[PDB]
Amino acid sequence: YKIPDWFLNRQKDVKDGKYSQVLANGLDNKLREDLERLKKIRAHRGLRHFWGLRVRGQHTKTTGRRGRT
Amino acid sequence: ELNEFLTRELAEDGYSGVEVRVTPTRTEIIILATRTQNVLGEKGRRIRELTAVVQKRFGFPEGSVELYAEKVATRGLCAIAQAESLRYKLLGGLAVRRACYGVLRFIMESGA
Amino acid sequence: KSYTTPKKNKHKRKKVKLAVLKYYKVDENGKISRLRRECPSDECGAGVFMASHFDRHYCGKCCLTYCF
Amino acid sequence: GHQQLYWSHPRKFGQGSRSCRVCSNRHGLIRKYGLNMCRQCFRQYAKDIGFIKLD
Amino acid sequence: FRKFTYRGVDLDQLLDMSYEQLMQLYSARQRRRLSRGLRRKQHSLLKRLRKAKKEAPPMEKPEVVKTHLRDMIILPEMVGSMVGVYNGKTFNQVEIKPEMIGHYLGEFSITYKPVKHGRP
Amino acid sequence: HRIRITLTSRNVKSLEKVCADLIRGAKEKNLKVKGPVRMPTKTLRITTRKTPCGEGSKTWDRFQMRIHKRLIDLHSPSEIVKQITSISIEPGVEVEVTIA
Amino acid sequence: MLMPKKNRIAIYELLFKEGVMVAKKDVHMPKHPELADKNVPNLHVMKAMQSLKSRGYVKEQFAWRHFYWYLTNEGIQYLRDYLHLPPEIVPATLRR
């Protein structure tokens, strides 16, 4: 129905390359398979999501106090 | 740069200050020092050496400049020259106090 | 001094004696016979030779390798 | 080659392209109006260049 | 067991296409690296490592070629190999999966060890 | 005849004295002369610290230069401009002569 | 330091023609400013003049980034024997 492709939230998916606007259960499923993909690929980002630390490269000594007990 | 270079060079001559002028094809610099027989070197050698140094280090057309030399009056009314004279008296090795009252007497008889 | 890590020595070039014997062959006739291929590059002269390897030759400071 | 490896880092940009013209230390430079000087040497020769204190 | 792909196409499908459309399939950051002039200034090391990865054994595990570089553009031409890149002290041996592409080999080797804590 | 003469210096007193010399020569030669147009001056504000190390109270300086410019437009041929430029030369003020 | 013959002797008649010369103190200087007709760096010039200093022919003074090298009369004699000249040619330093 003629919505521009750049406005959509998810573009160039790794499984098909098809542009698709995704919803609640779709975002939850896509986030958990992305987390599992990073865990299986064993990257630095995957280790950061597993450890619960900072992902985008920010400090932790001063801020982010409420990580755990 | 010119003032620091002449301060470093003529420390053993008694150098006070440089008088730079700007003129079409007569850009002249005057070095005011207490000694005239020692700034020129030997038959005008060191003045031409300094002229060549500034000539092809500062960046200038060759042959259009000349380095003058003159003596400053009232030697006891210049702070740089008297400090250099006390450095003369201290470099050979003397008591500091006799040199201090000596240069103070020189300042007082100069008219300060 | 003697450190923990070993050190390879520098390229100490071994001195070879009577090298001028091993440049030209001398017979009863006065005509010489060169034993090495000549470098035709203009950077070096016509008196220089090439290196003696087992597969192909090698020029001097020109560092040009010519095949067959 | 050591001669061709001696220039392997390009010094086009960054801090190392400029240096102090007096003390030759690449800390606290003044790139204002082509001084290319550190602050302490600029203080030592501020009135010699002509910078005075009025404000 | 399931079919692996990158943007809907296969590994051999990536193999038989050139860089001019490989960048069209890649993302925005990877395009500006590959489209910036000629790979000769500092990427002569990249070209020679790509030659060395094109050197191949007979039928076994391929050789490990440990490197001192971390900005490797992970291409489909080197999928299925063994490499350990330098992270300052040692070489972390990693096996190249088909999902390595779109990343860097320096991203797959951590520098700092996991930090533990005790009594202050 | 459309020659623009620009006078610029740092000390305003010597520049005012040489501008007085220019207008005195112009009135002596009995010809029309434009008055000295006074642009706003440009300031040289550099603010540096006082501590060479990182110890003590954070105090600063205020270094400043004033450059004053006053140009005279003269409706005379080039040789009079060259003669007046050749006379009365001091290192405090420079003379900028360039025909358009 | 292994110097080629031509560059060192070219430094020698540049020192002999005018008895004083300057050079900026920097290792990373691929080309001399004044002598740019042939590819000569600056570090060989500084090392050759330091050797001349240590064997006692020239003087040194350093202000910001530039070395100042001052010949002596016995240095002029050493240049006259090293360039192999008759003892009649005098450089312009001693000339008016």
Add this chain to the structure above:
RNA sequence: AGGAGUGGAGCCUGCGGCUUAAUUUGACUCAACACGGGAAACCUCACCCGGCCCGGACACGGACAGGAUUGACAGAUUGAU
């Protein structure tokens, strides 16, 4: 007497502590803690894992133009032709 506040919330920066092949160092109440003009991806770098160049001048004594050494190519090689 009052105004804005800080200290409580999230974020940036600095210090101590923990940790690290290394997380370089100085400054610890006014009178140190967005300070060293210090907003560091590489140079910065002074910290670490690693490898080459000498930038050991000048004198004394061993070796001399018949050579005292630098400059390199199919291939093992770090890291690099």
Add this chain to the structure above:
RNA sequence: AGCGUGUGCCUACCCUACGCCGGCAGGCGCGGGUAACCCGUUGAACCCCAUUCGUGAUGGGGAUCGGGGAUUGCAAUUAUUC
């Protein structure tokens, strides 16, 4: 509105008017300024006027984070930035 700033010894990083492409940051040409001359009458924000919202962790607050697209640079992964 007002302080200012704007093409470098080594040196290569200057300020932007004007017309196209694109939602966007940005992309090529036509130019001006070694400067009260050109950006520039620096059409700045706050503020003023008119709808929507209605005391609700709410169009408050925008931390955390996924994908995509551009510039700088030899190199951005431990997101440089937008």
